[PDB]
Amino acid sequence: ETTALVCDNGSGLVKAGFAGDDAPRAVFPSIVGRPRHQGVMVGMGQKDSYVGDEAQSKRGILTLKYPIEHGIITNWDDMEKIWHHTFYNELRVAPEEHPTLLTEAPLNPKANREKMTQIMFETFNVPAMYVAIQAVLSLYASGRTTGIVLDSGDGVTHNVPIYEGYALPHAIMRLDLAGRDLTDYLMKILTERGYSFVTTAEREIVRDIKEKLCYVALDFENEMATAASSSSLEKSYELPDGQVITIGNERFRCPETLFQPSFIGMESAGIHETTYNSIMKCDIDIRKDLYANNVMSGGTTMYPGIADRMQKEITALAPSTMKIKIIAPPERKYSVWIGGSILASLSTFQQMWITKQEYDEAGPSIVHRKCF
Amino acid sequence: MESAGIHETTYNSIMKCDIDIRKDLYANNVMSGGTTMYPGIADRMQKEITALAPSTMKIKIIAPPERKYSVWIGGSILASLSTFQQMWITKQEYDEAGPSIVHRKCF
Amino acid sequence: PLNPKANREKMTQIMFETFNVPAMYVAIQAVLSLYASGRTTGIVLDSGDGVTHNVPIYEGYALPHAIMRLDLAGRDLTDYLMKILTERGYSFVTTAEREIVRDIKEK
Amino acid sequence: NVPIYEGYALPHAIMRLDLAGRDLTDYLMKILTERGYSFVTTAEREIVRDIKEKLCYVALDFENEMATAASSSSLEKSYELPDGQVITIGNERFRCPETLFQPSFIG
Amino acid sequence: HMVVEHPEFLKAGKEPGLQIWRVEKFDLVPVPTNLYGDFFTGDAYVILKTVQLRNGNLQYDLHYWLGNECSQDESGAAAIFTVQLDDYLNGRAVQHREVQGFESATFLGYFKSGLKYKKGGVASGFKHVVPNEVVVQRLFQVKGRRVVRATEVPVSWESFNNGDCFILDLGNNIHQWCGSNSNRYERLKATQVSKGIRDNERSGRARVHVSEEGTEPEAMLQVLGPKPALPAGTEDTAKEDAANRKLAKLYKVSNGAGTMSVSLVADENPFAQGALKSEDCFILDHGKDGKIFVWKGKQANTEERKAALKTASDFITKMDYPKQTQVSVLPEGGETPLFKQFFKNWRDPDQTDGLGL
Ligand SMILES: Nc1ncnc2c1ncn2[C@@H]1O[C@H](COP(=O)(O)OP(=O)(O)OP(=O)(O)O)[C@@H](O)[C@H]1O
Ligand SMILES: [Ca+2]
Ligand SMILES: [Ca+2]
Ligand SMILES: [Ca+2]
Ligand SMILES: [Ca+2]
Ligand SMILES: [Ca+2]
Ligand SMILES: [Ca+2]
């Protein structure tokens, strides 16, 4: 009779809603703000901790902290504040009635799983609970049972090979750059034009500049040549102070950090050949399907031209005796939630819930044997 | 005096704030005091701030007719609020802490 | 704002010792003026007879680094009017004449 | 802050933190008002810079230095302004170098 | 590899043969036998063929077939039921993806007659929602001298007066209109209700605009029409303080006495926040403009909550409230700020006391 809840806890963007829906009900950034000046207007509803999009609204007069960094839960009290704001303020429901479905990062440490179980079962008193993986739920969102998933959100980039509807734990690999590092790179390469962004308050302004005005160059050197020669691609942006900035070659240099990590100094591989490195670690006989299902997921796959450049870079260094296609649905930024909505609404999911009484005579250890 | 006018003082008061809150502060300029009781000062203020600010912004200036006594009216409000009764500097706090209690309590 | 501390200690000392009040609070004028308007967000230009100060407050939180103060108010306007009235040959030197020039400035 | 390796800088690791002796001079201009000394214009900014150069020091630990400044008067010292008047400065001698370690003092 | 116990899988793969399943709203139904070999173009399907070997064991083969017009839930359901049916099996099966028009040659070989496709299919189990949508067009009059309260008023220029204050709610834009004859307390209440309806109902996804006479924005004039001559405003007396005092009725429902009990808590706002006990469930009835609020406790039983909803639904028909009355269900710590105005000094848990640090 009751409806389940899906809550995808992203590293910089958390999604939530009810099971059986074609889109998440609430999308809001996972930010906990704290005030940095003294409140002289007393009695007028001043709070010691602003959380969620409310913190994003009055972001100038706050210091902002991310409770999840790099896809892994670190600050737990702020993460409980994200949960309290999610259940009570956003979804406007009591947790005691509705079962709750959560999403976890691949290769999560088990202590984080046990503590997620403990603060769900003790603090909010849920009747049922379940934990699932980002990438395989994106693969179920793609309508496939076998493939690679490049899940590139705000914290990390994950490359997950899946065969027969199960991941292969030897072959999931992690590459630690995403849109936060792209925002910091764009923060670096706007200083030469004379515009300064140094604090966390205007970091979301630079993030909005990255979201509205970026594209992936199919070839980089000729795009340097045309950007240096002409000025057809130079476009203006309106800051909320009213100053108008203008952006030239920095519109497309910021996506290229993903393909060239030496732009921001680390020695690791770019996004195109680490998928090759992951797929060489798999068994041979599977690879004929495994190249064919190139599932792209995450909000940093929203750039125009990422698919054509991905197709070109895979087709350059894979052997030429095999066809490569790249698939990218328009809803792949919400695909983890869409997978959670379809899995929570199944006719076979009622026996896979972890009920309260099963938690009582097992403690916080039953989540390992059932979410598996 | 080589210091600039009240319009540029207002403008760089807005500019010293950080970038996210200029929008709301342009549209809520409030004047008070008897020295703002000249006729036509609001139009000159609107023209000078409209000249100094970028053209995309809307600038609104609030000049109520009771602005001479607005400090006292807000004082009657702040003394009348229910929250304020746990910020009174009592006699025993002054007796235990000297006159330096007022900088730890007020502002 | 930005008065010396010794004003606050001496004001505390004469209110608590001489008159023997049971409570005291002291507040900023521009905060009280923003209480009068009913808003929370805004910049208040409070200009009395001695002090003209700009205070911006976003939501409930004031920004003390953006507080501007200028000693340009009705006293200096009255004195400047007393200076420029000699161009028509009218001389005003005494304090009652300063009150009369204050009345003509108001009127 | 510039790292240099093999006699050449590393442009990815050079950073610019935008406060220096101008902002220290402006903060000392802010924190001399509470002793009753008023400096407003650019002519006496150089005097505040000279006061900052002659009488400042970085405290090794801040809170016990503030406690000893509040309790005793062994670190309070005088300066001779070029109009002949003598100012005195106490705990503000070391609070103004601390803005480099704590930028939240200037917001 | 945790095995499922759905009862329809018990007849799967027990004899050699060929079995077909159709998805209908996150569930499997087996299609009849004479409907084999043909499929709907707007549905997804699950295909099993299980084949006996010479040496004794029984091999399996799974396929999942997608139409070009099937919705997302049907395709994902076909994939997850293929995975769950393989998981119910002991991992001895192989899976294959089948696309409408682009099937494998072995898939054509199973059906003797061939493949024929018909339009239509079963409807999707999803319901259409957007992320972060509001469609709201309301107008609140706040009024009073000491006990200031809000009342919903219909959206027209004729409802405006100069003596009160008004809150025009238009979704992402909230407009605060102050009268010239309006006083200090209802201006403060209008500002407090405005910041509440921004930061609690919309969670900061709004922008609050403050305006007075002559400075009306284009949004107010576009929604409300051209501005007529305003019919002044009555001076704020003490009789409407008593009228605002008589607007809400706080009731209790609790099974602590071992039986059903609807009892009056109070009939005189401002109420006490401590009166809201956490083990019971309460009703506020501001039904003159059509609002009733069902406050649920954390330690309240389910039958108390159902009885509160039943009694609140009875209150439309008993006292003859008009037919736009909304039943708003409120848990602890997530209260609407229109509910908060009837209480004396509402305290959120993470509030700032004094100046703050
Ligand atoms: N149109 C866009 N253009 C560029 N970047 C975008 C766009 N839309 C979203 N992003 C970026 O995508 C990120 C958010 O994506 P997503 O919601 O998938 O991440 P997440 O779930 O929070 O992350 P993670 O998977 O690391 O936990 C942010 O860095 C955001 O700036
Ligand atoms: Ca994600
Ligand atoms: Ca004054
Ligand atoms: Ca269908
Ligand atoms: Ca198998
Ligand atoms: Ca009235
Ligand atoms: Ca009970």
From Swiss-Prot, chain C:
Q: Where is the signal peptide?
A: none
Which residues are recorded with the post-translational modification ADP-ribosylarginine? 69
Q: List every stretch annotated Interaction with alpha-actinin.
A: 2-15
Provide the record's note on post-translational modification. Answer: MICAL1 and MICAL2 produce the (R)-S-oxide form. The (R)-S-oxide form is reverted by MSRB1 and MSRB2, which promotes actin repolymerization. Can be mono-ADP-ribosylated on Arg-69 by SpvB of Salmonella spp. This modification blocks subsequent polymerization and leads to cell death.
Localization: Cytoplasm, Cytoskeleton
Q: Which family does it belong to?
A: Belongs to the actin family.
What does the UniProt function comment say about this protein?
Answer: Actins are highly conserved proteins that are involved in various types of cell motility and are ubiquitously expressed in all eukaryotic cells.
Query: What's the further remark here?
Result: In vertebrates 3 main groups of actin isoforms, alpha, beta and gamma have been identified. The alpha actins are found in muscle tissues and are a major constituent of the contractile apparatus. The beta and gamma actins coexist in most cell types as components of the cytoskeleton and as mediators of internal cell motility.
Question: Subunit comment for this entry?
Answer: Polymerization of globular actin (G-actin) leads to a structural filament (F-actin) in the form of a two-stranded helix. Each actin can bind to 4 others. Interacts with alpha-actinin. Identified in a complex composed of ACTA1, COBL, GSN and TMSB4X. Interacts with TTID. Interacts (via its C-terminus) with USP25.
UniProt protein name? Actin, alpha skeletal muscle
Organism phylogeny: Eukaryota, Metazoa, Chordata, Craniata, Vertebrata
**Covered residues, full protein:** 111 to 217 of 377
From Swiss-Prot, chain E:
Expressing tissues:
Phagocytic cells, platelets, fibroblasts, nonmuscle cells, smooth and skeletal muscle cells.
Which residues are Ca(2+) 4-binding? 279-280, 304
Renumbered residue ranges of the record's region Disordered: 197-235
Residues given in the record as Ca(2+) 3 binding sites: 163-164, 186, 236
According to the record, the residues making up region (Actin-severing) are 3-126
| UniProt region (Actin-actin interfilament contact point), positions on chain | 73-76
What this protein is reported to do is described as:
Calcium-regulated, actin-modulating protein that binds to the plus (or barbed) ends of actin monomers or filaments, preventing monomer exchange (end-blocking or capping). It can promote the assembly of monomers into filaments (nucleation) as well as sever filaments already formed. Plays a role in ciliogenesis.
> What is its quaternary makeup?
Binds to actin and to fibronectin. Identified in a complex composed of ACTA1, COBL, GSN and TMSB4X. Interacts with the inactive form of EIF2AK2/PKR. Interacts with FLII.
The protein's name in its UniProt record: Gelsolin
Species, as recorded: Homo sapiens (Human)
Lineage, top ranks: Eukaryota, Metazoa, Chordata, Craniata, Vertebrata
* Covered residues, full protein: 52 to 407 of 782
